[PDB]
């Protein structure tokens, strides 16, 4: 097994905790609790090779002034998340990428763009092609529309982060 | 056949270590800790809250050291109108270029500008927040104030600070300082790696020293130069680095004497008594354990420092003409160059996370019970008023779910304000150099704190975060208090405007010589000239009299 | 170089295993809820209680002491009138102890027989115990005051236990009984949450390291729907929780425990009568404790559990008795075998797993259990050394004033001696005895050696609160002190404050003693029979006659007493 | 390393706990704490062979109604103790040894008779020859006068017990 520090980033209430719990505890519950700091971990296998994951579910980008720098330096894999219910969550993913590439000081940072909550096709304000365009904009990065309420693309996120850390 | 001995020693050390964890957890005696609490003056408080980014520069917004500036009064006159300001904030919010930081910027600038007239600020914040609330096309009432997509939120944080500061110095500050001091002290009780700052004792698995370091508490007889001598006693560990020992001597001095021995640590040297003569010990000498491209720092144990050993101190003006060592901590690449404790089982030390969690628990309870406590059977004024606003608005949007009320209250008050104060203690207290570890621990405590507000009974399992398990047993008692705390404010008497206007006016007048509106409005204007077409296209749609446009263009005629 | 691979892999799997283990230990310790707990406490009538305390030797024969004939046995009248003498009984208590043929059991015997004889007149019993205790003190040969009452070298000591019991019964049934039964029940319930080894009674949840089941065992709480038969097909549902590792009998015991806990009546007197059936294909097959499909390690067979039968959650399970269809569905109770502990095994039998037997890795369970039942422990403790209505039990106050006045009678200027006497007389010689024998106070209480161990632990914890020395517990100290090492000082404070409060309470004239002791005496004069007592004391009077006669003659004895002695002999003879 | 179970029996305040602590921590503190149930254990090299000992510290004979028979049943070695300042305690050992032999249902049981507090010769009551004759009377039993205070024959007790368990 191998240690894999990952970080989940996004605006307030974009389904970070949701995806995380859905990935580790398997179950999802429509509950309203703001995350502050939650270091998870889980034994999981990728590419026929078992390793030890270490998830960090982060907080809202501005619910409070926080340790925004520490986990960017120490983190290795990054999953940026927006919600397809509010547009601003998509408008707030740029500065994230910026601070990541700045603090880490390199263009080769294992990252994945995720438009979560893809189970709402009536409240959709952010197109999938939009997120794909932002994905290609970031030096051809990965883009996976997911949903913690339907187990869609959930595992693929962390598996892709690990794979990108590999190569 | 060479596995039997290896496993013999292995399982031996294992047994010894687990047993030792149990023993320490059982033999943990409380000996933590103050006098007066060094709070921050309201100015530096407000400023370091409004702009946490520009660290020192915030003091430029403090006029504690305007008729000539013809552009300030005009723009202020513009802001004075509700329509112009509403369309302003709204139009600015509707922009894709408008980054996240820009919202905090404009919010802080706006609060800083209108800090003199809290009545207008309160009113316009009510209106704008209700706009965010009832007319939000892309928002769920239970996810309100969660996603930072409005000026009204950061502005709400600011206002929270403004109105609750008095309560902070009243009953929440002292226990907070006590919890922080107790935390630091506790962590520092057990070994800390100089390179990673991972200590044995903590409240975070991430910040955990996962190595069995056989150490031993020592009472060191410290002597001071002035030659000259002065006895003292410092409790240091055998695994402590030279600079760690130094830090402990300095701490002991500044505590037992009330004034610090120095301002700089780099300008002090430590001598040890070999056999009569005193040999000055350095961070890394010749015979140091070097493993490849990394070298081991000198510990006390490296010089065989016995218990009750003699220690001398050297200042840069005493005998440090030639007797001075270089500071390794300043090295631009120190991590890569030197190592201390690290260069193999983690969960074996989860027990430590319990130990500390118990040592610093009474203080946690004091802080929490204070935060949702009622002095003289009365809740804070701002709390009652704002919650009255939330109740009235919830009654004004055809909602029949008390959950929405609770959720709004838990997304507006403790999340926006109390976490900002809990995780950021240096926004409250002076001279508190913030360490990342303590930030992690505070993140754990703040996390538990707001878990005490959850309406969802979530059973903790094996796949739950260690931070959740660390406070999970204590959570459900807090929940019942939080639930009952909320209902007391509901059952609190309605706030008369006679008390309201006075409460606002006293502080407004008591803070009219604190902040300068000049720099504030001058920095606020820059967003107007950036997105003018938007502001005008919205304002003209919101039925703007010729007065607003004439005044606006007059302001633009005075600014350019 | 080929061995390095196997070594590395081994240490790896082992390490990760230890990870899963310790992790599960912490998670468990943090996620342990308190779903413990009753109503009417099965108290014993004073006759049965007192009889069990005085004679816990021959438990069943003690019914011979529970009650015309007195007037018939004139010998008993003479002996009785003789016992009422202070000098005589003094010589009678000392002369016996003086002889080396007089053992400890003899001393307990004498003390209790004398208590039963003198159970009608408890006034005199109090006063004679006072002189017997002061003589064990003032004129004591081997007297190191802070070591008094510890060695059982006298009759007076066991007597003192008896008297404490007699006088404090009321206080037990009033203020201490409930939390004690609540604690016994708490522990019992708590240990039944986790696996127990059917052959060693070692369990996972426990307060004793000796009793700890430091065995690797994967278990999971199974909810079982229980059906009762009454013919072939008769069914009524019942919910019973067991474990995957529970042996058949253990399951039976659980469903019976539950049944009694829902109907207040045992479904069966003997547990052997019940057999348990299982549904796999819609049909019910009786499961037996050991079958032809049971592994054997050397020469010992392994007991069949529920995981052995692949029992899943929500499984239906039938209960049969001996009058339903046991004409053919009868199994032989394995536990009945004489050498059942040698012929069978459950969860214990004497490379990764070789290092998974590490005892310390389970010590956290001791903590967990210690955490589980700590509320009841504190409740009991506080209710022992607490004072309802700001006053103390009559016997406690009175007796402590007696000790104080005794220290005054011997010129002692060390409060530590008074403390030591107080803690050697009452808690050691009484409270520990009720703590370690809850069956003395309750009925239908079957005490196990395991529960005996847990109660041992809590008792010792109780005793350290009466210590005078702040003991430095290190890596060398026993776990039973470690577990309660944090709660000790608070208890210590409460103890010193307790002795203070008792000392400062208003004194008691012998008028209250009169009405009280007369009330108890009149309450219990007819309950026991002084006949069997005196008749069983005569055996001791004539067996050491010359020594008692001598001891009495050396203390200026009247002709009356000795004439009465020889009269007693003549009456018992003729 | 095999596990040995050595049980320390005796009366009230003869020094069972004293001897056990002195053997375990090497410290003697003149205090007064009635033992109810204390379980010690320590790794010690016996006859050039590192074995794991487990010393059970019982209470006085009759301080409360107690579970005497359990540790007798499971115990592999026994160190009966008596204070030489009190003859009574020396008398009280007979029925104890009797119970040992009855429960073990044999006669070749690892056992040692220890007369503690042999440092108080001015306060001695029980002669050495008494205990010696008693040990001889108990089938050539092992006997030692010990002093946990003065560190006299403290380890040799448990040592000889271990050497007896492995004997015939
Ligand atoms: N329909 C749907 N709802 C979701 C999904 N993920 C999260 N949610 C809801 O969004 C709300 C807030 O999400 P949460 O994960 O708690 O926000 P965060 O902790 O800030 O990342 C929760 O109440 C969830 O019920 C999803 O994939 N589908
Ligand atoms: N002089 C002397 N005193 C002892 C010795 N062992 C024990 N004592 C004393 O006996 C007292 C009670 O001993 P303790 O260990 O509590 O007896 P236990 O009931 O067998 O545990 C203590 O206060 C000691 O001072 C010894 O070897 N020599
Ligand atoms: Mg979250
Ligand atoms: Mg003892």
Author numbering:
A (entry chain H): 1 to 167
B (entry chain D): 558 to 590, 593 to 624, 631 to 791, 796 to 912, 929 to 1145
C (entry chain A): 554 to 590, 593 to 622, 629 to 791, 794 to 913, 923 to 1146
D (entry chain E): 1 to 168
Question: What do the authors of the reporting publication say about this deposited model?
Answer:
Plexins are a large group of type I transmembrane proteins that serve as the major receptors for semaphorins. The plexin cytoplasmic region contains a juxtamembrane segment, a RhoGTPase binding domain (RBD) and a GTPase activating protein (GAP) domain. Instead it is active specifically to the Ras homolog Rap, and this RapGAP activity is critical for plexin signaling. Semaphorin binding to the plexin extracellular region induces formation of the active dimer of the cytoplasmic region, which triggers its GAP activity to inactivate Rap through the non-canonical catalytic mechanism for signal transduction.
To stabilize the interaction, we covalently linked plexinscyto and Rap1B in vitro by using a protein ligation system based on the transpeptidase activity of sortase from Staphylococcus aureus (see details in ‘Materials and methods’). We therefore used the γ-phosphate analog aluminum fluoride (AlFx, x = 3 or 4) to induce formation of the transition state complex between Rap(GDP) and plexin. We crystallized this complex with AlFx and determined the structure to 3.3 Å resolution. The asymmetric unit of the PlexinC1cyto/Rap1B complex structure contains four protomers of the complex, which are virtually identical to one another. The four PlexinC1 molecules form two pairs of dimers, consistent with the dimerization observed in solution. The GAP domain in PlexinC1 and Switches I (residues 30–38) and II (residues 59–67) in Rap constitute the majority of the binding interface, whereas the RBD in plexin is not involved and its role in GAP regulation remains unclear. The presumed arginine finger (Arg711) in PlexinC1 superimposes well with the arginine finger (Arg789) in p120GAP, playing the same role in catalysis by interacting with the AlFx and GDP in the active site. Switch II of Rap in the complex structure adopts an unprecedented conformation that is markedly different from both the p120GAP/Ras and the RapGAP/Rap complexes. Residues 60–63 in Switch II form a tight hairpin-like turn, which brings Gln63 close to AlF3 (therefore named the Gln63-in conformation). The Gln63-in conformation of Switch II is stabilized by numerous specific interactions between PlexinC1 and Rap.
